[PDB]
């Protein structure tokens, strides 16, 4: 058969290309560099869906270069897609997304991302010594500064005591890292980029008291003079954040610090008195 109309001009190639699975965004023509300078962060009105229900819905706030802003509320609330958003993995349909004044679907999605580090909840460790895992945050830099990275990370003794040292593979085809070693190389990437914003979403599994301490201080070292927002599910971060946000169905209900929000006795309120159980 002979195709017609249209189909007669269809590029196959530009078929093939559309068939592809995530179809992501575009840097605008003549987008120069994100000028960061402190990192502050706005959200003025977003609004944003994945689907035919709005996913998040008139999401106002502001993150003052420095401070921390915990995510909390429901499953599928949209605690995520908020960080999402900041990386720019999606446009939104409405409302506007600011790092330090400017529109960050308006730089290149490049700059932008060089200035955010994403703390994952899990952590790809990738078939390389221990040493190009952690360069993997910044692939320029130098041995003495991935080791800066695993010394502020707590794994730096870990690694001294591993056959290689820094030469020592891991991943899936060499030695097994234990789950609080594996947290520390996500850190110690971070750690390595230097970024002025980090995106953490809490892992949503534990591992024992004395670990579980140790990580959570090593990562509120990351976290400390960066603005940061996290998606929270330990009391911990929620209790010592600088602002919290309360979301239910794509909606800010709430927001405030950890003892403003007590004492409202709203939504987080009803939360924290179910998790005390006095
Ligand atoms: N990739 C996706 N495609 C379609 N819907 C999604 C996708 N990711 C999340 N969602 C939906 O968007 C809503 C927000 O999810 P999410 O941001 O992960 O919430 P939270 O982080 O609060 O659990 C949920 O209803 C979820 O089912
Ligand atoms: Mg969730």
Same mark, same amino acid.
């Given at each position: 058969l002979v195709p017609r109309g249209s189909h007669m001009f269809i590029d196959m190639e530009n078929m093939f290309d559309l068939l592809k699975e995530e179809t992501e965004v575009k840097d605008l023509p003549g987008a120069g560099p994100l000028?960061?300078?402190?990192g502050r962060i706005e959200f003025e009105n977003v609004h944003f869906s994945? %689907?035919?229900? =709005?996913?998040?819905?008139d999401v106002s706030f502001t993150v003052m270069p420095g401070q921390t802003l915990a995510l909390v509320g @429901?499953?599928? %609330?949209?605690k995520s897609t908020i960080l999402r958003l900041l990386f720019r993995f999606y446009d939104i349909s409405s409302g506007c997304i600011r790092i330090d004044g400017q529109?960050?679907?308006?730089?290149?999605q490049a700059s932008l991302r060089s200035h955010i580090g994403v703390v994952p909840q899990d952590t790809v460790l990738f078939n390389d010594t221990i040493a190009d895992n952690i360069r993997?945050?910044?692939?320029? %830099?130098?041995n003495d500064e991935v080791e800066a990275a695993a010394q502020a990370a707590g794994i730096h003794d870990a690694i001294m005591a591993f @056959? =290689?040292?820094?030469?020592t593979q891991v991943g899936e085809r060499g030695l097994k890292l234990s789950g609080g070693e594996k947290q520390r190389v996500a850190i110690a990437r971070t750690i390595l980029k230097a970024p002025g914003i980090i995106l953490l979403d809490e892992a949503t599994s534990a591992l024992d008291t004395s670990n579980e301490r140790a990580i959570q201080a090593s990562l509120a070292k990351v976290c400390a003079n960066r603005t940061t927002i996290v998606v929270a599910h330990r009391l911990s971060t929620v209790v010592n954040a600088d602002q919290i946000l309360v979301i239910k169905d794509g909606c800010i209900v709430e927001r405030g610090r950890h003892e403003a929000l007590l004492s409202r006795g709203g939504v987080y309120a009803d939360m924290w008195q179910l998790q005390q159980g006095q």
């Open positions: 000028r960061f300078q402190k994945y %689907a035919d229900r =709005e996913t998040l819905q @429901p499953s599928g %609330a949209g529109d960050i679907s308006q730089v290149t993997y945050g910044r692939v320029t %830099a130098g @056959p =290689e040292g820094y030469r």
